[model samples]
Structures are given as C-alpha cells and as structure tokens.
Target: ANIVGGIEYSINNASLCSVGFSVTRGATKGFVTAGHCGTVNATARIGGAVVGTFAARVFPGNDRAWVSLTSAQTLLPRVANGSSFVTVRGSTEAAVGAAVCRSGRTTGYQCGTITAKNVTANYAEGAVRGLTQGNACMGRGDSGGSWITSAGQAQGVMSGGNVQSNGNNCGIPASQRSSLFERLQPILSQYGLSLVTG
Candidate 1:
C-alpha cells in the first residue's frame, strides 16, 4: 500500500528518484523506471522502509529498467497526483501534440505536450534512442517519474531534460523547457511487463 509511482525514494541512499510506473512480470509485481536511476542490485528505500531492488538496468543504450519489488510493497492501480488519485485505464499510445501530464516528487504534477517521438538523445555516456520529447518542466529528482494522460493512459517515464539555463530552473520559459522519456511500449516489451491499471 505504501509503494506507488510518483513516490520519491532514495537509490542506495544516494540518488533521489521516482517510481514512474508500477508493473508486473506475470505474478511478480515491480516497477518500471529510468535505467540511469539505479544499477542492477541497487536497493531502493522510502523513508528507510524497504521498497525493492533493481533487477535489471541498461543505461546509455536504453533508458529503461525495472524494480523487483519486495513483499512490503502492495501494488495499486491509481496514478498519483499529489493529494489527487488518477485511476489509470489503458496504455494506448498518444499521438504527437497530444496533451500529457507527468508526476514526480520534485514537481508533483505538470502538464505538457508530446513535441515529438522516436527521438535519439546523446548523453555523455552515449546515445539512447527512441525517446519521447515533451515541453514539461522536469527538475532534479524528477528522473524516473511517470508520464500519463488525463484520461489515465500510461505514456512514458522521465529519463532526461534539457534546461535552457546552466542551472536547474523549472520556472524557465515554457518554450525552453523540454524533457526526454522512455516510452512505455519498448519498456514493457523489453521486459515482458504489464502496467497496473484500475
């Protein structure tokens, strides 16, 4: 009952990240998030309570991964929106220019548009392809956050963002705010995972 996407947790007590989406590989319940958030075997914690461990993670090449949850976490289908709860319905892909919202601990909920799809992003580590771009304001600790539609369709998870300024500034002009996220399709297919839906 305690664990859900949009809840912020510490990765090995170092990196601050959000869960993104709760998923399952058959009967095994877990979470899907950015691979760059943590590595294989990295333990995640919410206020010292055990959440899960990263079972698989692939960075540079792909910014997707999952958490093999511990028994302490009970799965839920509701998408978090601060005090509000968005009961998820489906995962059908939204078209470009469609309006979408994202959830993160740093910025609870922010709405944006799908600027583009199938984008290739190059990082210091290497190049990651097939990322979806949005004009949402993603700030620190927003990585691995959930991206969902108003109708509650699971879209993607936050991977990286391009801030116009040298420092982190979510208040920047809307035109200068952009972020990249790994689409749910590839993540689910790559891991044979299913999203927890209401």
Candidate 2:
C-alpha cells in the first residue's frame, strides 16, 4: 500500500502497471518498473496518492525505468509473496531452468521455471532484447511487476507475455502462456543505482 513492489501503480491516470521494486541512488529514493510504463517525467501514483515521477525510461529496446520520489514516502524492501511477505535481501541473476515467482496486482502470485535467458521479444510496440523468459502465466495489468526467486533474490521486472491464448488472465496452463522480464542487473548498472534490500 505504501509503494511496495508487486502492487498496482498508475501513471497520470492513463495506465495501470504493476510496480517492480524499490531502488536508490545515494540519498534519492525511487522505484524501478517497466520502461513502457511511463515516459520521462510522467506522474506516478498509487491509490490516488502521488508517489513520484518517472525520471527516466526506455522502451522498444530494454524495458526499464526508475521513478524519482517527490513525496514523503519510504520504500520498503519487500514484495507480496502469496499471503506472506518476502524480504528482499539482494539481487542475483538466476540461471536458466531455475525456479522463479512473480506477483502482480491483477493475478496475485504465481510460480514457474526460468525457461530461457538473454532472449528477445518482438512486440507490437517494438523489439526488446536481453529479456529473461519464463513459463509462467501472466496477463494484462501485470507488466512492471516483480519477479524473484523463492529465496528473496530479485531477478527482474515483468515486461510482457503471450496472453492472447490465456484469455488475458494469468494462472493459465503452463504451455498456454509465457512471460518476458527485463533483467535487474543491467538496469541497476545502467542507472548507477542499488537495490534496496532489507
């Protein structure tokens, strides 16, 4: 509710995208999300409360962005995990075939295996590269959500998925849907930021 990851965040009342995780650049605090979620300086909000603005964003290549907080909000280093909470300890890129889970405002929480890494997806918007693929079922309103390993290791942020077959909902059969995520490591390195771990 206080701008944690895996929750719904709105942009200028135009679109709704799930938030990924909290991040920081020295004293400045913000959160990371899919680049396609908003453009530079776009207003970011949660439940009618202004949280921040999109400081930087990139799309059609690597879907990643960070919001710079303008409100008196504190970032929590945790994400929704089922009925519990997963404290983010650190970010470690998981290898292919490893188990991963994701949380979204629409679909709640779901688990799946990392089907591939460093993959490219060509969407109607554009082509995004360096994405990690998973066999999880994801749907609309799920983009920009959190993807992490069971041990509370941050992995990536939800990009897009083949939701047409799943009828625009997650929890579909394994083969009916797959998701792409923008790796967290590259985004952190590019932005000169650090993941807010507990």
Candidate 3:
C-alpha cells in the first residue's frame, strides 16, 4: 500500500501515530515521525497490516524517528489533506507568525501560525527542547503528523499539545489553543536522511 505523511499508522497494534514526511537514507525509502510514537524496531502497521520497522527512535530528549519501509510499501513526499494531499516541495523552516498548518490523522487539516520557536516543552514523558509552538487543535493519534508551511514546504513533526477535556478542537481559529512540533531539520541531520521532496 502507499503511505504518505500525516496518515495514521499503528505501531505494534499498541498505539496510533501519524507519519511526518517522506524521507530516504541512501536508497532506502522511509518516513520520519515522532519518536515518542514508537520504539526502535517496533512494527509499524496500517489497516492492521505491517508496513515497516522503526529503524531509529529518539524520544523525550528529541522527539523524532523514522521507519524504513518494506518492499510492499511505498512512500510519497506529500501530506494527506482532508480527502486530498499537499505535495512537499522542500523543508524550509518558516518564521514565527508565519502561516502554518497541521495535517493530522485526528484533526485532519487545521491552519494556524507559528507562535514561537526554540521552545522547551515539559511533557509527562519528558521535556523536549527546540520545538516549534503553535495552535492547530490537534488530538491523540495526531502525534507524529506533519506541520507544513502554506507554501507546502515541510517544517516539522507533531510533538505534543493540550486539547479539550473530551475531544479535539477546543476552540476555533487555532490560535485560541496551543500545539507543538519537533522541527524537521534536526531529525534529518541527525539521521543523515534526505527529504523526498516533490
């Protein structure tokens, strides 16, 4: 099956998490996601079928990871947007207050602005530094999703945030609440992976 960014993928049938962007290491095709979403060597599945394995994982300290796909799976440089998709053209970091949107498996697509950068967030799992902060009304299972610029440039991976007491979208206009994404460049550099841009 084909796999794209922001699509929900289960890890070992234990939890659901979205992928971030299409990536490749040498000739090995893969996808980047949130580290907290899965553990090293955990089976990444979709529709109850196995897709690949988490080749590398870094959580708490960094919050990034990647899955090396099997021959049966294919990866594309795009994010699932609603019923469509947004092609990833590059991985250019946007500025604070720049237009950004989160394509989440749980919240779908929600546009917002970058409220801050180089943030250090204190999560129950642990504190993560250098996260981009915003408000996109994300929900559970949205962790590891894609956060891109309006121009379709890849930006980051969904890290963490607070939603409503019961469900997502606690308010309208995104800026009303807060979310965070682990900046993409660091992960790419750390893993020596290249973005599979369109």
Give the lowest summed-lDDT range of ten residues in model 2. 164-173
Per-model TM-score on C-alpha atoms: 0.94, 0.94, 0.95
- Residue pairs with colliding backbones in model 2 are 35-64
Off by over 4 Å in 3: none
Task: Report the candidate with higher lDDT, 1 versus 3.
Answer: 3
> What TM value does model 1 have?
0.94
Clashing pairs in 1: none
Model 1: per-residue Cα lDDT over 1-198, one tens digit each: 466678788899899898888888998889888999999999888877778899898898889889999766888776678798876677898999999988888878888898988888898899998899988777778889889999999998888887545434477866776688899888898889988888
User: Residue 146 deviation, candidate 2, in Å?
Assistant: 0.5
lDDT for each residue of candidate 3 in 1-198, tens digit (9 for 90 to 100): 677888889999899999899888998888999999989999998877888999998889889999988877787888888889899999989989898998878888878788988888788888998899987678888899999986888999999886676666545556577688999999999999999888
User: What ranking of all candidate models by TM-score puts the best one first?
Assistant: 3, 2, 1
TM-score: which is higher, 1 or 3? 3
